[PDB]
Design a protein around this ligand. Structure first.
Ligand SMILES: *Cc1c(COP(=O)(O)O)cnc(C)c1O
Ligand SMILES: *Cc1c(COP(=O)(O)O)cnc(C)c1O
Lengths: 422, 434
């Protein structure tokens, strides 16, 4: 039986996000090795989780050593040195000396859930501001508000109310705040680059101004950097690009370099408001913790933010070259190695090319390239490879992507129909 | 400055369940190693997550090889070999009626939530039966049908029905047979529209409720009432599953097979991993529905496999049954000496010891229990308490715990009983506990 056929038989549809029959048995650096023998360049990096790539020496060393001599298995019922070392390391990376503490999780979902629960418990303020198209996780607790003030994301490519500046969204926020009692909203949840929305970098200056308004109202600013955080944006934290510092930082995916690990950096008052309150047995386990430590160590050691900045420009330069040749490309956006490329039927009408996008990723897979699409309209290719990816791998991936566009016709809508996707 | 103070400075209280200042920098077998190098026998096994203990060679080999050559990092947008192999291995070991599939998670919390969300999605029946005192998780979705104190302050599912647990030591309405509970169930089902309940969540030994083994034959009768009303039976074996009970699956003791099995804790051997074994119709009813990026990651999956292969190779069910008798015998020996010990219960290496002020009226001895484990810690033995009354000592050691470890543990436990008055009220007040 083929690996992909075994998968369909053993594993239920519930957790499947499948677009093509990718069936993996290995990985080395930025390359996935399929069962069938072929290597593929990973432009996805498991949605950004594989920050250091596959089999990075630092991850192997840290994880192997931890497995061999684990400081227990939890942070709930015992303090453990790896988790404490990682916590101090995270506090050191954030402007929160004496003011902030750490909460460890398994995922961005449980981390966002925990932040919200803790905010409500600590402040009694259960009202929330979030953006339409926001992704804060896929559990009841994180979809709770992923009471609610929904704002449009300030998208330069598709302005709200005919205002490219985004200032009409700040005016909307002002009205929504005045419409409801002061002290009713406890938190604003932001993505400093929108993920599921289609890798949208907000217009310049918007978020600084957004945060200002929140602070004026005693509203906590929660920055969700599960996707775009830890070196990936060309700086360590994505908010560094934006002229503000959040009250709360949520971290996940790439934090674990392949292991389940998330963290909330939050004021001490928020995280000390109760004990035994948001906890799961393997939270703060020393094997995930040691993996996270290796990720942060490598980020500093190998200057991964500068690597991401340098390699992102190269990638996005590459994409612009393809745009001269392929009219489908309408917008190329991003910071560092978090890039999006939106595909449109007309560049002036900006009408989304959904069908063509689906064929494009399927085709790219046949050619030896792993890339997925996101967006409200299913028309934005997401690029989040290992920060470790080689300049050679980028150029190869660019050729394959070029090839994919030239060969969309080679993919039928019935090959697309076999994979349920989103 | 020392590790425990550094922890208070860096890590919030929100996720802390602390009973004493245990500060760990290492582990070997059934032993935890503190910052200064002092060794402690771990009878908790991290609430049973450390199924194979610490630094077990099979976990080390599995994890190191998977880190070196990982099959991606996900089962969401890719199939990977470690996860499928693990899925089929779990499937092979389940004596299911019909055909079943696997959902993979990080924890028993996300697994219970996902099981429930899938049932509601597959069937449209949102009503749920769970037991008073039930612990199914600490996420919004899994707290919705839980009954423990941790979940006491959370939003409960509409159509949640809570039944008393069949506790031999504290029988509901003083009926030792458990008949009054099945009678209560019957009255509950008919105060509610026919076909409205989709699920019944069962702990085959109730964990946080006080490590409670139900009356013999009760769960089979309970399962029968559910099956006759179209209600799917969900067996939460996160705590008490995979060899720990003296059998591979704890339901093997109760003479019924569940529709859905939930796994976690010990499944990962120290890495985050859970699983749901559910009928195909339930797990296939939707796609991209209940998902987190690192679900089915190949490193957690490799450990899961090392756990099941070790369970098989070392016949860990048979080991647990014997080591468990050895442990409960030793505890019975302690009962003959210390009047606080009111009840000793459990299967295999899942054991509970309830402490009471008086053996006749069985009033819970809360203050002594806290002092007991604090003293045990000082003597070099790690053990926690559970229960609605905070009076139940829980023993869930690594399944690979040696006989000598157990004897050493029994001696330190004996000593901790003799010496609990050494522990001051002020010392305990420093730890928030439950
Ligand atoms: C992936 C992601 C999450 C959720 O993380 P999981 O690990 O999938 O639960 C939350 N927020 C953002 C911005 C993400 O990208
Ligand atoms: C521990 C436990 C859970 C929850 O598992 P986490 O790892 O804490 O999410 C659920 N049910 C039972 C019976 C448990 O023991």
């Amino acid at each position: 039986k083929a690996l992909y056929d075994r998968d369909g038989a053993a594993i239920g549809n519930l957790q499947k996000l499948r677009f093509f029959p990718l069936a993996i048995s290995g990985g080395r650096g930025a390359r996935l090795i399929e069962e069938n023998g072929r290597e593929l360049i990973d432009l996805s990096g498991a949605w950004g989780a594989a920050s250091l790539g596959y089999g990075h020496p630092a991850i192997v060393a840290a994880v192997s050593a931890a497995a061999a001599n684990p400081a227990g298995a939890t942070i709930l019922s015992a303090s453990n040195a790896p988790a404490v070392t990682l916590a101090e390391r995270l506090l050191a990376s954030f402007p929160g000396e004496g003011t902030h503490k750490i909460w460890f999780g398994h995922s961005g979902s449980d981390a966002n859930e925990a932040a919200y629960r803790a905010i409500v418990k600590a402040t009694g303020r259960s009202g929330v501001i979030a953006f339409a198209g926001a992704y804060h996780g896929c559990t009841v607790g994180s979809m709770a508000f992923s009471g609610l003030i929904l704002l449009p994301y300030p998208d330069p490519y598709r302005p709200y109310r005919n205002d490219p500046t985004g200032d009409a969204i700040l005016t909307l926020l002002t009205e929504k705040l005045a419409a409801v009692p002061a002290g009713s909203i406890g938190a604003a949840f932001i993505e400093p680059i929108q993920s599921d929305g289609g890798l949208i970098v907000p217009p310049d200056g918007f978020l600084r101004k957004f945060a200002d308004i929140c602070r004026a109202h005693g509203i906590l600013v929660v920055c969700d950097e599960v996707k775009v955080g830890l070196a990936r944006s060309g700086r360590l934290h994505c908010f560094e690009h934006e002229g503000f510092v959040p009250d709360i930082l949520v971290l996940g995916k790439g934090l674990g370099g392949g292991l389940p690990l998330s963290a909330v950096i939050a004021p001490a008052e928020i995280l000390d408001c109760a004990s035994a309150f948001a906890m799961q047995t393997l939270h703060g386990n020393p094997i995930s913790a040691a993996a996270g430590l290796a990720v942060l160590e490598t980020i500093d050691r190998d200057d991964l933010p500068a690597m991401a900045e340098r390699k992102g420009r190269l990638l996005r330069d590459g994409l612009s070259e393809l745009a001269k040749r392929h009219p489908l490309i309408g917008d190329i956006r991003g910071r560092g190695l978090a890039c999006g490329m939106e595909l449109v039927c007309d560049r002036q009408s900006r009408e989304p090319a959904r069908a063509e996008t689906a064929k494009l990723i399927y085709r790219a897979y046949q050619l030896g390239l792993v890339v997925y699409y996101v967006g409200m309209n299913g028309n934005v290719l997401e690029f989040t490879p290992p920060l470790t990816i080689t300049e050679t791998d980028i150029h190869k991936a660019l050729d394959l992507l070029d090839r994919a566009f030239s060969e969309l016709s080679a993919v039928s809508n019935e090959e697309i129909a076999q994979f349920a996707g989103w």
